[PDB]
């Protein structure tokens, strides 16, 4: 006699666990290169002669 | 959820400035001198 209906529930639809550590956070930097400088730049020279 | 545990790490140990001259010769040493005399006729014999 008049059994009601609560309304069953279920999986909303988005079952993708968003847990990858990217988090939009710019992750680790990349190998820092380099170069030399003004090494000896000798000026005058002895010039024994 | 549970095992979520990314155990990675950004690029470490890459900092230096590569490109060292790795030895570049040099401007050059100052050479030692020598007595600027000369060979000749330092003979006791003089004007004939």
Descriptive account of the structure:
It is classed as protein fibril. This is part of a larger assembly, with two copies of chain A. The termini of chain A are far apart. Chain A is rod-shaped. Chain A is largely without helices or strands. The first copy, chain A, contains no helices and no strands. Chains A and B meet through loops of A and loops of B.
Q: Could you provide a short overview of the structure?
A:
It is classed as protein fibril. This is part of a larger assembly, with two copies of chain A. By secondary structure, chain A is largely without helices or strands.
Kindly state the percentage of residues in helix of chain A: under 10%
Tell me the distance between the termini of chain A: 124 Å
Shape of chain A: rod-shaped
Q: What integer value in Å does the Rg of chain A equal?
A: 36 Å
Largest sheet of chain A: none
Number of helices of chain A: 0
What's the total count of β strands of chain A?
0
Class based on secondary structure composition and strand pairing of chain A = little secondary structure
Largest interface: A-B, 21 and 25 residues
What portion of the residues of chain A fall into strands of 2 or more residues? under 5%
- From the structure provided, what is the oligomeric state, counting identical versus distinct chains? part of a larger assembly
Using brief descriptors, characterize the structure shown:
part of a larger assembly, 2 chains, 49 residues, little secondary structure
């Amino acid at each position: 006699g008049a059994p009601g209906a609560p309304g069953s529930q279920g999986a909303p639809g988005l079952q993708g666990a968003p847990g990858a550590p990217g988090s939009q956070g710019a992750p680790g930097l990349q190998g820092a290169p380099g170069a030399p400088g003004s090494q000896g730049a000798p000026g005058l020279q002895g010039a024994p002669g």
